[PDB]
Design a protein around this ligand. Structure first.
Ligand SMILES: Cc1cc2nc3c(=O)[nH]c(=O)nc-3n(C[C@H](O)[C@H](O)[C@H](O)COP(=O)(O)O)c2cc1C
Ligand SMILES: Cc1cc2nc3c(=O)[nH]c(=O)nc-3n(C[C@H](O)[C@H](O)[C@H](O)COP(=O)(O)O)c2cc1C
Lengths: 246, 246
């Protein structure tokens, strides 16, 4: 398998970091690789905010749910869906901005930010660094907008903790190929596959905690998806000037 | 510096393919790399449908807006935001599925699908193959759901055209670093950067068409984003059991 494939295949997210600062040469490579990725209609609907200042990064850590790894790492990247450039583009050509009144602008912005994050991940991890995305930036997103001074048509999607690792960690097992990859049409027989994966996941958790926790995949997923954990999501989009087509 | 960064740095979407079929060994590597990528709460909210049958793949091409490259390439991947596994997980633990009644489930599903599309992009491109994501899967989404037999809590995000290229094409220039990468806080002075970017994009389009087309970046973006081009987006999510918190 190629160095590119071995960077993706050997993926492990880390929460343990060193005092070692991320150099500007490393950051520029992470931003250039993220920009190099594909974007819907070459509109490049992703804005990246680099937070290195401890005080600001501490506020971001608390607003994401007091995650120790955010304040631990020297650099915290923030992937925002950006339609402000599309607004400047429309103003330059005396045209209105219609897309932001539909749910498509939300789907375009979120999908593009996921593409940019993964490119930033594969670039950073190939350099020897450790990454962990922070989807928790949508916990208190109105406070995130105020902090990062986000204008109209810009919304925070996910964060990304970039730093030098202190621990190698362990690869979390993934769902069986047959459960994720469906040939030609959708495969509805997935219950047995989820049951077999839960058995493998309970054994993984057991070996990870030294027989302290028996948490399977279905257990830990259903506990958080039991409710609407992030209520301020619609309030965040409606504040930035995004509307929907009922 | 390394093979992973090199694969991303020289990226280009391929729209001209050969009759050469994508092997099972290549497909399995692309799928395994996509699964190897990070997912919000390890929920793995991405489902991948492999379309290799010419007749089905032709229907998907015509629904995406007569995109020739879809019927030309031997494989047409389709990344779907999946909460049906989360529904099976909740049923196995006698728990309700609350997340789907909020906009967070839409943001999680779209961001995670973008990640999995990017992990497949770097894997396929490093193997020598050519790719082109299809955002056109959202043109007639209700027909896509019928075709792929997409159940409740499952929605099409973006397709991916994988095949053996017949031409190298060219790298599309990206926005100036200062316009996409903002240090500490958001930079509101982007108009001048877009204007300079339009001059460099008009020159790019002149050299690629041999002085036939003068299309700049802002003009291309203004025209499409002038309106809500995909109206069946909210009509797709709601049909698939997704609600919004008002
Ligand atoms: C969009 C997104 C959001 C995430 N948010 C968080 C988060 O708030 N906190 C955290 O510690 N990990 C977060 N993660 C990391 C996941 O928990 C992790 O990727 C998953 O458990 C898979 O494990 P692995 O990446 O270590 O192989 C997130 C991942 C993604 C892709
Ligand atoms: C989510 C997404 C959707 C896209 N949808 C389409 C599409 O419907 N048709 C198409 O030909 N290209 C589509 N593309 C490809 C873009 O036009 C292309 O990535 C962009 O012009 C940047 O150029 P490059 O990837 O060749 O460097 C899409 C890309 C992404 C990331």
């Amino acid at each position: 398998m190629n160095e590119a494939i071995r960077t993706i295949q050997d993926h492990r997210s880390i929460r343990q970091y060193t005092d070692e600062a991320v150099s500007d040469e490393h950051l520029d490579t992470i931003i250039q690789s993220a920009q190099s990725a594909a974007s819907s209609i070459n509109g490049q609907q992703v804005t990246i905010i680099s937070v290195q200042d401890k005080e600001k990064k501490k506020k971001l850590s608390e607003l994401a749910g007091n995650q120790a790894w955010i304040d631990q790492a020297p650099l915290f990247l923030i992937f925002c869906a950006d339609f402000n450039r599309a607004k400047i583009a429309a103003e330059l050509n005396d045209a209105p901005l219609g897309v932001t009144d539909g749910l498509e602008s939300i789907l375009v912005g979120a999908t593009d930010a996921g593409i940019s994050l993964e490119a930033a991940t594969v670039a950073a991890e190939s350099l020897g660094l450790g990454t962990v995305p922070i989807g928790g930036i949508r916990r208190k997103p109105l406070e995130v907008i105020e902090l990062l001074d986000l204008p109209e048509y810009v919304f925070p999607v996910s964060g990304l903790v970039v730093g030098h690792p202190s621990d190698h960690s362990a690869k979390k097992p993934r769902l069986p190929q047959a459960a994720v990859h469906h040939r030609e049409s959708y495969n509805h027989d997935l219950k047995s596959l989820i049951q077999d994966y839960d058995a493998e996941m309970a054994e993984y958790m057991k070996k990870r905690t030294n027989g302290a926790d028996d948490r399977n995949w279905s257990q830990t997923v259903s506990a958080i998806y039991k409710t609407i954990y992030y209520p301020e999501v619609r309030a965040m989009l409606e504040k930035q000037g995004f509307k929907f087509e009922k």
